[PDB]
Amino acid sequence: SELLVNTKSGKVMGTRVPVLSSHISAFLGIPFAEPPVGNMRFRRPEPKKPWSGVWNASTYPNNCQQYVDEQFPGFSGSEMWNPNREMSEDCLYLNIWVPSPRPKSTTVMVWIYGGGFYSGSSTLDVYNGKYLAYTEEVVLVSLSYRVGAFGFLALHGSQEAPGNVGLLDQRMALQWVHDNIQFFGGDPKTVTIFGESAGGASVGMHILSPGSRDLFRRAILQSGSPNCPWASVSVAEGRRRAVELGRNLNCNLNSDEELIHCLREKKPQELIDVEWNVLPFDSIFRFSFVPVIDGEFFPTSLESMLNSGNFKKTQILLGVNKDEGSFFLLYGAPGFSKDSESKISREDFMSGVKLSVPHANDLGLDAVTLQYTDWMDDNNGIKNRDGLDDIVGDHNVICPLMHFVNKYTKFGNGTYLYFFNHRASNLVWPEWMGVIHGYEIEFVFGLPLVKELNYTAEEEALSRRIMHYWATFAKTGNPNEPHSQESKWPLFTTKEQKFIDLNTEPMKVHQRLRVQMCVFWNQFLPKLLNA
Amino acid sequence: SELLVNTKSGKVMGTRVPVLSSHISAFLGIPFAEPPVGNMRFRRPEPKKPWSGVWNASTYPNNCQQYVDEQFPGFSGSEMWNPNREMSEDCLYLNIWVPSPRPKSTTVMVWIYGGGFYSGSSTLDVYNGKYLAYTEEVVLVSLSYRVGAFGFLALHGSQEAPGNVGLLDQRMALQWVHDNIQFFGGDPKTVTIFGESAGGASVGMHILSPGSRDLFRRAILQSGSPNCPWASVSVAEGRRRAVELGRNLNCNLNSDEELIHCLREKKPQELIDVEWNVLPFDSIFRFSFVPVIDGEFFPTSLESMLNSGNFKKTQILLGVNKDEGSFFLLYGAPGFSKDSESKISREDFMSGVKLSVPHANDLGLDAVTLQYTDWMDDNNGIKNRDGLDDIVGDHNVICPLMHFVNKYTKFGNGTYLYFFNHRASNLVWPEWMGVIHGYEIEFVFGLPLVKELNYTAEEEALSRRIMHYWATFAKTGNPNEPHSQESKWPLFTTKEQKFIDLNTEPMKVHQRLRVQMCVFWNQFLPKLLNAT
Ligand SMILES: COc1cc(CNC(=O)CCCCCCCCCNc2c3c(nc4cc(Cl)ccc24)C[C@H]2CC(C)C[C@@H]3C2)ccc1O
Ligand SMILES: COc1cc(CNC(=O)CCCCCCCCCNc2c3c(nc4cc(Cl)ccc24)C[C@H]2C[C@H](C)C[C@@H]3C2)ccc1O
Ligand SMILES: CC(=O)N[C@@H]1[C@@H](O)[C@H](O)[C@@H](CO)O[C@H]1O
Ligand SMILES: *[C@@H]1O[C@H](CO)[C@@H](O)[C@H](O)[C@H]1NC(C)=O
Ligand SMILES: *[C@@H]1O[C@H](CO)[C@@H](O)[C@H](O)[C@H]1NC(C)=O
Ligand SMILES: *[C@@H]1O[C@H](CO)[C@@H](O)[C@H](O)[C@H]1NC(C)=O
Numbered sequence A: 001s002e003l004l005v006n007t008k009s010g011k012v013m014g015t016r017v018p019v020l021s022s023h024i025s026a027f028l029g030i031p032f033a034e035p036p037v038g039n040m041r042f043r044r045p046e047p048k049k050p051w052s053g054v055w056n057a058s059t060y061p062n063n064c065q066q067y068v069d070e071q072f073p074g075f076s077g078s079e080m081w082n083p084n085r086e087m088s089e090d091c092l093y094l095n096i097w098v099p100s101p102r103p104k105s106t107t108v109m110v111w112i113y114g115g116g117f118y119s120g121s122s123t124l125d126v127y128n129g130k131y132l133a134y135t136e137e138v139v140l141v142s143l144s145y146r147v148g149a150f151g152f153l154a155l156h157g158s159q160e161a162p163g164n165v166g167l168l169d170q171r172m173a174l175q176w177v178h179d180n181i182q183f184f185g186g187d188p189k190t191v192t193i194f195g196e197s198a199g200g201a202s203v204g205m206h207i208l209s210p211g212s213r214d215l216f217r218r219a220i221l222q223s224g225s226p227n228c229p230w231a232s233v234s235v236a237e238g239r240r241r242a243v244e245l246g247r248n249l250n251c252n253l254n255s256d257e258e259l260i261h262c263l264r265e266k267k268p269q270e271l272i273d274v275e276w277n278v279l280p281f282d283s284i285f286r287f288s289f290v291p292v293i294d295g296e297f298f299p300t301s302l303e304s305m306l307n308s309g310n311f312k313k314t315q316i317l318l319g320v321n322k323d324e325g326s327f328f329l330l331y332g333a334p335g336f337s338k339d340s341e342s343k344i345s346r347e348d349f350m351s352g353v354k355l356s357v358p359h360a361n362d363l364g365l366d367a368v369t370l371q372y373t374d375w376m377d378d379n380n381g382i383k384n385r386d387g388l389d390d391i392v393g394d395h396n397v398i399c400p401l402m403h404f405v406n407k408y409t410k411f412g413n414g415t416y417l418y419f420f421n422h423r424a425s426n427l428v429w430p431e432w433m434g435v436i437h438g439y440e441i442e443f444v445f446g447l448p449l450v451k452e453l454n455y456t457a458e459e460e461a462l463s464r465r466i467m468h469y470w471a472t473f474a475k476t477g478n479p480n481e482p483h484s485q486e487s488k489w490p491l492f493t494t495k496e497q498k499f500i501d502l503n504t505e506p507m508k509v510h511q512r513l514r515v516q517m518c519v520f521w522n523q524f525l526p527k528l529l530n531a
Numbered sequence B: 001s002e003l004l005v006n007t008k009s010g011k012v013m014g015t016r017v018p019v020l021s022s023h024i025s026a027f028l029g030i031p032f033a034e035p036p037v038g039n040m041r042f043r044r045p046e047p048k049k050p051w052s053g054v055w056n057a058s059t060y061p062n063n064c065q066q067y068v069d070e071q072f073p074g075f076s077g078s079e080m081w082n083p084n085r086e087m088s089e090d091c092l093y094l095n096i097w098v099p100s101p102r103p104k105s106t107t108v109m110v111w112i113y114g115g116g117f118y119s120g121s122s123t124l125d126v127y128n129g130k131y132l133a134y135t136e137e138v139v140l141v142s143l144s145y146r147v148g149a150f151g152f153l154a155l156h157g158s159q160e161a162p163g164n165v166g167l168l169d170q171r172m173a174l175q176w177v178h179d180n181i182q183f184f185g186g187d188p189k190t191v192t193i194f195g196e197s198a199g200g201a202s203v204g205m206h207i208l209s210p211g212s213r214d215l216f217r218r219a220i221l222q223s224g225s226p227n228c229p230w231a232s233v234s235v236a237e238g239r240r241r242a243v244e245l246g247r248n249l250n251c252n253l254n255s256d257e258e259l260i261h262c263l264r265e266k267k268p269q270e271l272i273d274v275e276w277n278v279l280p281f282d283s284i285f286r287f288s289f290v291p292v293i294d295g296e297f298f299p300t301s302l303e304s305m306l307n308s309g310n311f312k313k314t315q316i317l318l319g320v321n322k323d324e325g326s327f328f329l330l331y332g333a334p335g336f337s338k339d340s341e342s343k344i345s346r347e348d349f350m351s352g353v354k355l356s357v358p359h360a361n362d363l364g365l366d367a368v369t370l371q372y373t374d375w376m377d378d379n380n381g382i383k384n385r386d387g388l389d390d391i392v393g394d395h396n397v398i399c400p401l402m403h404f405v406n407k408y409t410k411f412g413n414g415t416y417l418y419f420f421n422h423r424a425s426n427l428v429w430p431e432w433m434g435v436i437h438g439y440e441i442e443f444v445f446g447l448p449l450v451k452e453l454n455y456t457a458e459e460e461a462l463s464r465r466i467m468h469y470w471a472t473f474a475k476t477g478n479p480n481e482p483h484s485q486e487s488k489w490p491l492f493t494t495k496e497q498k499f500i501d502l503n504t505e506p507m508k509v510h511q512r513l514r515v516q517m518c519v520f521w522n523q524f525l526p527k528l529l530n531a532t
């Protein structure tokens, strides 16, 4: 009855789950596409064929095939991102958390996980939708999509491996929500898509892509935007990486059909094992198989679409964390360690900026170095460390997002910008890494409300305020309740460019997030590199 | 007797002048070269032919022909720099102040005036050597040299207008000091040359030039260095400007001989009236006729000479002022005024940096703008004004001098670096201009010791400390007195890069003078301009 729901594709049976001394309904692992296996590897998704009988939706689905991190085996801080379910190419499923009793027609939020387009699972403990659905009375969906080569191998001109199919997976799950969420008590006219990292880029990509725009109402982008330098490649570079993937696997490279046929006969892990070898440079914060600017999902360049206003005009809420770059330095740059303060020598600083800006010529490298070096104190290992941290986060996350937010706000219907700079009391990563890429997610999903996780009382308060901002924005297009007595998160406007800090202190309003460095990254350096 | 001196070129009769309730000897207007007039215009100087009888050295000489500033007529702050004597091409004279009684063999200091190589006079009130000669017991010489086209018109390959003749004027006066200062109580083996602005650049050029190195012992450079961007041109650019000067005056341009013959028939003011017209850009802090890198006075490029250590190895003392740029903005850039705080709009800021870096492409201007703009507060007229001020001073004075000091110290025998950041209490210019290009000179020459000039008691002490640093350095190669109990001015070293502030407060040591901006001007921007 409450757990038995008839959808347009067939019947589903959910499960009653406990949450904070109450219960809600969970529908886990609902299929929304045909399994993209066999000759359907690299292909656009096809809708799931209707099934007879009752789909048992009491269990999380498989996770998509992906590179599994083994840098710190058994360490909770890194394992919490790895697939916690069996991996399979049969992975196109979504999960729904529904308040109990079922609401009539309530706001829908659809989570798009991140992971650089190479990793990610809907089933991670930090993406458990039950705290947000219960506390804010929303229908919380989490979708999945093919990652890595399976989702973003791109041989433009081919219909067998066109590229962007992971974005099409997301779109087909949004289409499924549009057609079916009403049967779960959700309003298909009030769907907010939100995501972090590649999920945030994806959200912005659906804002841009005409074929996506009518499948959601408004959007939240966390630490990611569609114009990020890691988030797309040209059709020529996507083809080169695809060909290099076959070369790494002794494939016939004389035609698309032969290359594709060879790659389709490999086991998933054979592709994954060489995935990182197709990158053009030694780099950090670069991923092999990402969306392509193809002339179809994206009709023109992202920059020209942003300039012309050729995107969905709605409300957006978006923001960044204080130390986006630290995790990438830890994993990929010399002198960084999980178990030390990672003071960086000048020689390791210079190596880090070459890894961080891999496309830069020597003059561009000099420019980055000068912009981020204190020449009164150039051997200060802390300043070198934090300088490199800033380089990675500004270039890869903050300044791309600020470019997006400024272009979008020119045509949009309301922008809200945040700067998340709270370091969790119970963080397992060292202090030098600061406020890490991904670590606002646990506040967005209400994990500080779980007494056993040992967050402080004010972190619970911060999580509750963030969930209420996100949900109230989802319901209304404004994170504020306008008749409340609480401090108001102001609109971001072209002129005054206001944002708020998100942390445990009373609200502060600021202006021009990281404006100085983002002039460097968004205006000066591109002009230098194009000279 | 004390005033009657027999030099190698003839007898000279000086005069007894008052100085601070005492007296000393002054020999004013001694000729050291033949008058470079008529067909000797543009030529190298020739030694003054000996004279019979007694040369009357009681009176300042004429000043060389130069552009005269009329922006603020009668205003003391500008008039103090203009010629205070009749202008004439017959201007190659030097002045000497000797302590009384005449010392046996004391330290000599030779002042080389600045003025962008287009202007300047040995006779300005602020260059009066009597206070420094008296207070520090030194023989103080001030030379002169042709400026403008008369000193620096360069048609390389012509022996009639070869270029650099103003530098050769300075050398001829140094040669004269070498040969004759012993007759005035000076030691020709302990001569310190010092100068400000173009005079500081000149001092550096004599350090570089093989033909100058044996005519002095040590050097002081004030707000100028030989590698400054305004201080020299290539032989091609010098020839372009010489031809363009002829074009402005309807001259035959077919040959050097015909062009020079035309230019020698013009009256001095005719050349001066069009002098600024030959600059290749709208700019500030650029001057038309300047030293040329000719392969003769300078055997190779300045940078190669600095890199190879092909220069005189000795002790140097040098430094800069806090606000070198402000004077040039006042006279040449939109939005600046003597009579207001000169808050600068962003539109006038952008025009200013274009005028300040005339040789930069658009990417270069963008780089300058980014380095000096606070994009949290870009419509702040005060920040825009001070940012422009810093750009001008950093690009034209401070960073070129820091490049020189770092290159020199690698081979030299002792570097002392100062940063002069005191604003005179009686300053006549507005507060926004800060510590102006030229305004350390009055402290170097002891004017605060003159009660009628209304400096504070603290400023008199600063001047006496500066005079003592300068003269003690001249005597010994070290500004510090050995077993003194006062705080010590440390050697600038490649590694620690120490310098001192010069102001009324107790001396403080710092390191790496404007290092961040000078990485930009000395390394990044040149690499950007060369690459784009
Ligand atoms: C390319 O550079 C320019 C080109 C132009 C175009 N110029 C013209 O049309 C000619 C008119 C501008 C001529 C300006 C002459 C000013 C010389 C005044 N002498 C001073 C001097 C010094 N300091 C001064 C400080 C103040 Cl506040 C005021 C005057 C000072 C210190 C000196 C250095 C000098 C270069 C000149 C002289 C001695 C204008 C300005 C420029 O900067
Ligand atoms: C060919 O040259 C290259 C060769 C290589 C070689 N690369 C390799 O061998 C593999 C290195 C990739 C290691 C993958 C680690 C997975 C990170 C796990 N996910 C995290 C995630 C987030 N935050 C994390 C924060 C910390 Cl402190 C730790 C992990 C986080 C937030 C997310 C965004 C992500 C991109 C991944 C995931 C979700 C790399 C670069 C090159 O240029
Ligand atoms: C499961 C599997 O490997 N199927 C392959 C398919 O990928 C390929 O395109 C096709 C071409 O004939 O051959 C099949 O055997
Ligand atoms: C559905 O799956 C759950 C989890 O294993 C199980 O407890 C339940 O009995 C299943 N119901 C069926 C198969 O009808
Ligand atoms: C959003 O659009 C509505 C509808 O036209 C308009 O009235 C409102 O002013 C817009 N708000 C913003 C912040 O653009
Ligand atoms: C929280 O703290 C208690 C004691 O303070 C400890 O026993 C418990 O294991 C902690 N919880 C976690 C998840 O570490």
Ligand SMILES: *[C@@H]1O[C@H](CO)[C@@H](O)[C@H](O)[C@H]1NC(C)=O
Binding pocket: B056, B058, B059
């Ligand atoms: C030298 O000249 C000055 C002024 O021109 C004059 O007063 C003085 O008498 C002259 N001396 C002699 C000896 O002629």
Ligand SMILES: *[C@@H]1O[C@H](CO)[C@@H](O)[C@H](O)[C@H]1NC(C)=O
Binding pocket: B412, B413, B414, B415, B491
């Ligand atoms: C100057 O040279 C002398 C003689 O070689 C040497 O003893 C002295 O250390 C040098 N001083 C500096 C500061 O280089």
Ligand SMILES: [Cl-]
Binding pocket: A323, A386, A431, A432, A433, A434
């Ligand atoms: Cl930190």
Ligand SMILES: [Cl-]
Binding pocket: A409, A410, A492, A493, A494, A495
């Ligand atoms: Cl707006």
